[PDB]
Design an enzyme around this catalytic site. Structure first.
Site, mmCIF file in Angstrom:
data_model
loop_
_atom_site.group_PDB
_atom_site.id
_atom_site.type_symbol
_atom_site.label_atom_id
_atom_site.label_comp_id
_atom_site.label_asym_id
_atom_site.label_seq_id
_atom_site.Cartn_x
_atom_site.Cartn_y
_atom_site.Cartn_z
ATOM 1 N N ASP B 49 0.932 -1.118 -0.193
ATOM 2 C CA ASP B 49 0.067 -0.082 0.042
ATOM 3 C C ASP B 49 0.946 1.285 -0.069
ATOM 4 O O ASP B 49 1.679 1.832 0.587
ATOM 5 C CB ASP B 49 -1.163 -0.072 0.861
ATOM 6 C CG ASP B 49 -1.784 1.503 0.736
ATOM 7 O OD1 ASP B 49 -2.841 0.723 -0.206
ATOM 8 O OD2 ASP B 49 -1.697 2.070 1.885
ATOM 9 N N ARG B 50 0.523 2.158 -0.235
ATOM 10 C CA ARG B 50 1.495 2.931 -1.085
ATOM 11 C C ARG B 50 1.521 4.805 0.318
ATOM 12 O O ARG B 50 2.070 4.727 0.578
ATOM 13 C CB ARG B 50 0.858 3.826 -2.495
ATOM 14 C CG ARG B 50 1.450 3.440 -3.678
ATOM 15 C CD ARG B 50 1.671 2.161 -3.831
ATOM 16 N NE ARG B 50 -0.400 1.640 -3.835
ATOM 17 C CZ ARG B 50 -0.729 0.516 -3.666
ATOM 18 N NH1 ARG B 50 -0.509 -0.359 -3.647
ATOM 19 N NH2 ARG B 50 -2.173 0.579 -4.107
ATOM 20 N N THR B 51 0.103 5.156 0.783
ATOM 21 C CA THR B 51 -0.326 5.958 1.566
ATOM 22 C C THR B 51 0.165 5.655 2.930
ATOM 23 O O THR B 51 1.240 5.922 3.359
ATOM 24 C CB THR B 51 -1.327 5.937 1.728
ATOM 25 O OG1 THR B 51 -1.750 6.957 0.563
ATOM 26 C CG2 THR B 51 -1.865 6.928 2.959
ATOM 27 N N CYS B 84 -1.925 5.358 -10.755
ATOM 28 C CA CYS B 84 -1.810 5.424 -9.429
ATOM 29 C C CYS B 84 -1.401 6.524 -8.627
ATOM 30 O O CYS B 84 -0.201 6.557 -9.544
ATOM 31 C CB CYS B 84 -1.949 4.243 -8.536
ATOM 32 S SG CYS B 84 -1.542 4.862 -7.125
ATOM 33 N N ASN B 85 -1.886 7.360 -8.733
ATOM 34 C CA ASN B 85 -1.439 8.761 -9.040
ATOM 35 C C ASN B 85 -0.629 9.097 -7.096
ATOM 36 O O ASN B 85 1.189 9.365 -7.403
ATOM 37 C CB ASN B 85 -2.852 9.833 -8.094
ATOM 38 C CG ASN B 85 -3.354 10.548 -9.184
ATOM 39 O OD1 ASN B 85 -4.740 9.769 -9.337
ATOM 40 N ND2 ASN B 85 -3.752 11.629 -8.975
ATOM 41 N N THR B 86 -0.673 8.174 -6.392
ATOM 42 C CA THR B 86 1.036 8.056 -5.355
ATOM 43 C C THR B 86 1.247 7.150 -5.217
ATOM 44 O O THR B 86 2.520 8.000 -4.395
ATOM 45 C CB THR B 86 -1.138 7.046 -3.301
ATOM 46 O OG1 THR B 86 -1.734 8.122 -3.447
ATOM 47 C CG2 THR B 86 0.702 7.358 -2.593
ATOM 48 N N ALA B 87 1.766 6.968 -6.109
ATOM 49 C CA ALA B 87 2.465 6.060 -6.502
ATOM 50 C C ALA B 87 3.306 6.800 -7.545
ATOM 51 O O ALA B 87 4.596 6.970 -7.567
ATOM 52 C CB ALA B 87 2.313 5.269 -7.950
ATOM 53 N N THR B 125 -5.535 11.131 -1.639
ATOM 54 C CA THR B 125 -5.427 9.880 -0.652
ATOM 55 C C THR B 125 -4.996 11.005 0.304
ATOM 56 O O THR B 125 -4.083 11.701 -0.913
ATOM 57 C CB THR B 125 -4.201 8.340 -1.087
ATOM 58 O OG1 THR B 125 -3.189 8.698 -1.338
ATOM 59 C CG2 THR B 125 -5.396 8.277 -2.064
ATOM 60 N N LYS B 164 -12.352 0.557 -2.897
ATOM 61 C CA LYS B 164 -11.245 -0.853 -2.592
ATOM 62 C C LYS B 164 -11.902 -2.037 -2.291
ATOM 63 O O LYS B 164 -10.889 -2.960 -2.439
ATOM 64 C CB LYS B 164 -9.671 -0.522 -2.470
ATOM 65 C CG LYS B 164 -8.629 0.405 -3.286
ATOM 66 C CD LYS B 164 -7.733 0.813 -2.266
ATOM 67 C CE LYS B 164 -6.508 2.216 -3.645
ATOM 68 N NZ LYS B 164 -5.719 1.074 -4.524
ATOM 69 N N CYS B 194 -7.148 10.379 -7.816
ATOM 70 C CA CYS B 194 -6.991 8.783 -7.216
ATOM 71 C C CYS B 194 -7.884 8.253 -8.171
ATOM 72 O O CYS B 194 -8.833 8.558 -8.784
ATOM 73 C CB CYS B 194 -7.719 8.959 -5.639
ATOM 74 S SG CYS B 194 -8.165 7.367 -5.370
#
Ligand SMILES: OC[C@H]1O[C@@](CO)(O[C@H]2O[C@H](CO)[C@@H](O)[C@H](O)[C@H]2O)[C@@H](O)[C@@H]1O
Ligand SMILES: [Mg+2]
Lengths: 235, 233
Positions: B49-51, B84-87, B125, B164, B194
């Site tokens: 998980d990125r966050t 994926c934005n957070t990535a 996120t 998710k 996101c």
């Protein structure tokens, strides 16, 4: 992407909308609490594969060497099991299974396995080639099924629906297909196999308006691939 | 593989990846299957998980991202996109190791905002907000980003993770009031920052008084432009 990860390759792109639909269904049909619980997948949606029906009926260029190339690409990427979301492409299934290292699972058997045992007389919506080459016929006979296919005029309209969806107009495709479904029902179909992977996209949302169960070849193949992945002692 | 094939380094999450494929079909003009964009997709969701990595001290996704990137390149992908934005916290590092072209979701998304919208809401996120992924780029363009307040952001985060987990209906009940709050606060547009967000919102855009900017669709359009720029395509 480990082979030991039991990654599933999707040899897709026939057509691309059906491939995207299969991905959505892997998410829907897998029980997962979070991203990390979903099925590992590598997908080839490389649509330049020559038209399957034109090859089989008109002697157009064969898809075979493309399928073989993309199958090895998936295997080389780590796919341990391969699924093809195109019914017509299963004309080449046995040939590909001869060269494949990875396990392969047939959309045909997965689909027939998902028909209720009580439906003996079953409609079939598929491409002209799937019908002409009889891809479902031997397997259905073995299961004691009678397949009901649209007559010539109706079949041309079913084929037009499929190619209309492939060109991207779902509304026009529905207006062509739905009357053919009712004809199958009027002729006594106890269930109808959606035997072309664009058909579920055309039908989606209308199942309630349709008096008999539709058997979704894409969803059947996804369920089979899920069972395969889940069978392993480490998954 | 095919000339100029696009790799999608996906699986974060898998629903967003499926949404991306659907959009490649929608947004590319094609006479038939054979005129569609060639794509090879990694949706191999075991990426941490990125966050959780960024704000919670969880295991880093980086080495997974690097591995699957190489996998796509080895398979013949000549351009890579990440839904994926957070990535994108790792985008610069990945671009350094990549031989293939990479296209950032952040720039593609900001570039699709109407020039008239100065004050823009951001749905993303916690990690995307905390590490300021959109922040420097937005200010350069003269944008002012509005984000939900603490309580509201917890609900946005809940909505994302609810999608998710596979419940779109529950995610919608959570998200829609946060969209209304952003508009009440003066958002001229809202970035869905996101890739799960467009999945939650889909079917509701009419009810929504301001334009929603789809990060996934922006990225797809940028990749299509890249593909079509080849004279031999
Ligand atoms: O009808 C059985 C026949 O189908 C093949 C493929 O054509 O395998 C299918 O059926 C098997 C048994 O039900 C499944 O295990 C397999 O996944 C499926 O592809 C042949 O192998 C088999 O002889
Ligand atoms: Mg198991």
């Amino acid at each position: 992407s480990n082979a030991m990860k039991h990654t599933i390759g999707i040899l897709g792109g026939m057509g691309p909308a059906a491939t995207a639909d299969m991905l959505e269904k892997f998410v829907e049909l897998r029980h997962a609490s979070c991203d990390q619980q979903h099925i590992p997948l590598i997908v080839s949606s490389i649509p330049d594969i020559p038209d399957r029906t034109a090859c089989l009926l008109s002697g157009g260029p064969s898809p075979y060497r493309y399928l073989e190339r993309y199958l090895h690409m998936l295997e080389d990427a780590g796919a341990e099991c391969i699924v093809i979301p195109c019914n017509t492409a299963h004309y080449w299934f046995d040939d590909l299974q001869n060269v494949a290292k990875a396990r392969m699972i047939s959309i045909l058997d997965a689909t027939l396995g998902d028909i209720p045992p009580s439906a003996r007389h079953v409609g079939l919506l598929a491409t002209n080639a799937t019908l002409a080459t009889g891809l479902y016929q031997k397997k259905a006979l073995a299961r004691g099924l009678t397949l009901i296919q649209p007559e010539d005029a109706g079949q041309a309209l079913v084929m037009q629906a499929i190619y209309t969806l492939k060109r991207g107009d779902k509304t026009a495709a529905q207006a062509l297909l739905l009357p053919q479904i009712d004809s199958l029902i009027a002729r006594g179909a106890q269930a109808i196999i959606m035997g072309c992977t664009e058909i579920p996209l055309i039908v989606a949302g209308h199942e309630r308006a349709i008096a008999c169960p539709m058997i979704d070849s894409t969803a059947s193949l996804v369920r089979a691939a899920i069972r395969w992945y889940e069978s392993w002692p480490d998954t």
